[PDB]
Design a protein around this nucleic acid. Sequence first.
RNA 1: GCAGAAGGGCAAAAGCUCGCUUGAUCUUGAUUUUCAGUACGAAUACAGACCGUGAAAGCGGGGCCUCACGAUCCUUCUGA
RNA 2: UUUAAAUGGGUAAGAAGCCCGGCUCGCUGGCGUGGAGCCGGGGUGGAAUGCGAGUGCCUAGUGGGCCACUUUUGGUAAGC
RNA 3: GAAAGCCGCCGUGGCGCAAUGAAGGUGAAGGCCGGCGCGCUCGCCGGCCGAGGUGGGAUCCCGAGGCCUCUCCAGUCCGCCGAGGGGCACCACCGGCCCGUCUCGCCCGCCGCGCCGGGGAGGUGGAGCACGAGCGCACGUGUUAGGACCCGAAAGAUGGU
RNA 4: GCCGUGUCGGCGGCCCGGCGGAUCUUUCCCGCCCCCGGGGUCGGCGGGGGACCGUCCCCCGGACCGGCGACCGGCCGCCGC
RNA 5: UCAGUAACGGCGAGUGAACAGGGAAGAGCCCAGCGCCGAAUCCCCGCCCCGCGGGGCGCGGGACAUGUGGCGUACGGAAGACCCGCUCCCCGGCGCCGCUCGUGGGGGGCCCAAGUCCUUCUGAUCGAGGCCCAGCCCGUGGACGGUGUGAGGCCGGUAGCGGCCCCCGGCGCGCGCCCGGGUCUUCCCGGAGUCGGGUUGCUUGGGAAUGCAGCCCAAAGCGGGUGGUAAACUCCAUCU
Lengths: 205, 147, 97
Amino acid sequence: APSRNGMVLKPHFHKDWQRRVATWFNQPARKIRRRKARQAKARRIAPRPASGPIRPIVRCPTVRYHTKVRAGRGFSLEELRVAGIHKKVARTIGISVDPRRRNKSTESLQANVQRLKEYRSKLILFPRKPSAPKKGDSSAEELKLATQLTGPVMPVRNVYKKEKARVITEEEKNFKAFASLRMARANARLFGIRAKRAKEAAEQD
Amino acid sequence: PSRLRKTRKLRGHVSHGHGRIGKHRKHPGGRGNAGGLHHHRINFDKYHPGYFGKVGMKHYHLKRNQSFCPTVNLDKLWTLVSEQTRVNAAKNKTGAAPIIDVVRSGYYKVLGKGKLPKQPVIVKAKFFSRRAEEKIKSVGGACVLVA
Amino acid sequence: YPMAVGLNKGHKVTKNVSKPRHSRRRGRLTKHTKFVRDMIREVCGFAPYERRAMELLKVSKDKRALKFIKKRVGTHIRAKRKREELSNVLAAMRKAA
RNA sequence: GCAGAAGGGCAAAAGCUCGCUUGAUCUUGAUUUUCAGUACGAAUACAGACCGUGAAAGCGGGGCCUCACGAUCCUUCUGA
RNA sequence: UUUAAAUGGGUAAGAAGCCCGGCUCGCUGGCGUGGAGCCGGGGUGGAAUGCGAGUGCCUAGUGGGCCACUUUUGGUAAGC
RNA sequence: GAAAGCCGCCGUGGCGCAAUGAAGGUGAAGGCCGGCGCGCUCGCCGGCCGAGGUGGGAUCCCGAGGCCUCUCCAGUCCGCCGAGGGGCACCACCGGCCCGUCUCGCCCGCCGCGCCGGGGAGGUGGAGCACGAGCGCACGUGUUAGGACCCGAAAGAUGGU
RNA sequence: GCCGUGUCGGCGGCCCGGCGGAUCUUUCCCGCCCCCGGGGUCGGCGGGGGACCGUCCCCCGGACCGGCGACCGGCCGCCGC
RNA sequence: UCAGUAACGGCGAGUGAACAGGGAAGAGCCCAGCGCCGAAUCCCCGCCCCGCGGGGCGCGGGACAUGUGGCGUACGGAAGACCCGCUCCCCGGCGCCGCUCGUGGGGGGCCCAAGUCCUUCUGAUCGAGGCCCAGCCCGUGGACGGUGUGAGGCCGGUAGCGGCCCCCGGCGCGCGCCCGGGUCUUCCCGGAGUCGGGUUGCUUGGGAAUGCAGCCCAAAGCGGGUGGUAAACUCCAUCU
Ligand SMILES: [Mg+2]
Ligand SMILES: [Mg+2]
Ligand SMILES: [Mg+2]
């Protein structure tokens, strides 16, 4: 069955696969079924923003992706605690809440508090009949538009710094080299062994 | 295109391009990679040497994110910034060298590749090779390391 | 001079101090619950393996006692914890008399 | 005569007797034979160590040469 | 088996060849020895006949053969 | 119109742009000039540059000389040109570089002087480097897996009458 | 009357011009961190501003061709009436 | 997408996931326990407030239930007492008005223009023709039926065409329900023949056992589970 210089191959067709076949013939039909499920969901709700609540700034895990910024799930009660809004009030203000999320850094904590107060300062509420607590006159003169598009406060905006130009000085052109990588990597794995021989000379008397 | 193929041209001829003697049936050598050590052995060496056996250590559940480091070597290093930077770098004021950080360009390690130009840089990478950083320290540049 | 590999790894941030999440204080003894388990182990008593254990734990030896508790209660981290609270009954039976 | 089946080879010898020895060791490639010009096996010429013998040149990394043997998977021992 | 054909097999019949000058070497070693290598310079018409070659990829069919000179094996011989 | 059109802070991702090792990991630029340390079989500082060298090599460039109704004076052109030059792709060869291992060796470094890091010179193993050629789409041939060019058993299994 | 291409200039339109830049400006403008009610560029943060460079929109001069981009004048030679 | 990858496999033929990442969609909660409230709770029957198209909050009797109904409470903590500065709400039912983004749904019946002149034919929908207004209509030149090939003869098709009948989701009079937040102080704080272990089966890519199941043994409470090589020690992370 094999021949001249070729590829040794494993087609996974040793199983009755013509019954379990999937053809995407309804796929234009479902694209105009979930546009009409977005349009008849936009006009059904309110002047409330389409594509739902405000999402947080979130950094990705796992070395490959930890230099980018992603839209997250909720707002991690500590960030709701500092911003001053209540946890059961917040999801009818338009603010997503994920109670199982942890804040253990401070800079990424203060980023989303700045984000959450910037949202509250660009929000207009409607009283049912015009009582308006925490709210004043005509609704920002009818709120300048109707409904937003694919993100209320532009959820990614992954930004990079300027770091314009520097002068190649001493102690910078001279030290932080490949020897610093090799010695720091070796002391990372010779740490527990060297702390064992130190015990052996501590029980030496 | 059924028009352009061999079976329209081969219709009228008896064995249909397969021979009176051999008379192509279904599976005369077995199905797939059958007999790879026995009767198809001379095919599997001379074209796939290495195909049979254990060769290393097993690592259960590897994650293709722990080992992720892309590389850029030094010829592709000045294209990470504009060409408007390096023409502005060398026009005789002071030792003002630009930054080139490969991490916001999506690279982690800087390898060596000759003809890094005469200007100084400060290059912010996660890792360096020793051929790479001594090309940089010979154009008057610096090699600053980032986590 | 921060770097990725070595012994002080990672980008340097500053830690957020926080009172820990309430789910983590789950198996604490909570003195009324201490009262319920300590009252009910004298109306009910000891299991047959841990009466044989504490009559090996007073006379026979201790390496053979835990070898008997290794087999019946499952693991080693469970066998020592059982062996030390049978010894605290055996100490309270004899030395508190 | 050279252990033996044959053939080739061999005379201050490759035989016979004696004297020391362990090169029947450690390691990388190349090549020949079978051949697809693949493998094992066998062989050849080296190279680098460490050795033996001899006064020395040298010879020796098994048997005077042509035969005497065995993959993957698994087991086992050895090595830094 | 001393001797030993006919047919046959290999190689050679130039410029990648020849000569001269110099210099590198950790190889070799009485020696400006030996041998390799490198650079530079000098002289092209070097058996007959015929012919355009060189090179890579992809590749089907085939893997039962049969006969006749001459040469030969088994067999009494055979359209064996 | 189940089409077509657009997005680009929708390029995430795929393949390619870098290889090698079981792995920890490491990871592809050289030559000259001028000097110096025992110019010590080894090297060091500064400049010039910059993919090395040899043999072939289409094309191109130069080209003495050569070719015209009367002789000495000047112009474009074109054909013939021995010779010489820079040499494409590519082939053969030599050198070089990176990784794995081997042997022999000496030197340098300090977020800390160590059963620490780095370097050297020779030899071998690699699907490498030596100024990138890939990607997407379409077609054709080939091989394979699928009922697989068409038809064909003796069977085996499950559930029933 | 005309547009093609280098060369600019009027920096003109840049503040009543488009876009692009991992160019610059720690003296601009907004909510903050670093110390003794105030303050130090005292190093920046989030954003806006306006310089510079790269390319495209006019005006005067200048360069060539007026190229299948053309009309009028005169010329030559046709053409039907 | 990862990825035909890690991994499994007479390591042969073959098999073969996940986590990041980009999207589609996005919504969160309740209980037993532990405490508190005179069982503050529920079901049935009888006559009524008063009703359409029938279900109730009101009244009176029989049961349920303390072996525990209901309220407030749920691990993101909770409750109570303080103190501090706010605030009077939500829900359905009834009547009708005002809409409904393709312009809400269902149903019926309606809506442009040659059958003109000549001509061929069994029969025309054929062929020719309609002044310098292009013979007529066109938001209608889809389709089909009519003695043959029809924009105009006829259903229709076009059009935010018109009128009809029934039905739906949503404003505003009467019922029904109604103190939240912060700071401090004290008290409270959890699911067992289950986890786990051994062994045997089946299963998985899961490999010194991924999952499941039988049998045996069987917990703890700074505990337990997980951290992809069996085990001991140790630290950390994470979940409950
Ligand atoms: Mg065939
Ligand atoms: Mg064929
Ligand atoms: Mg059967």
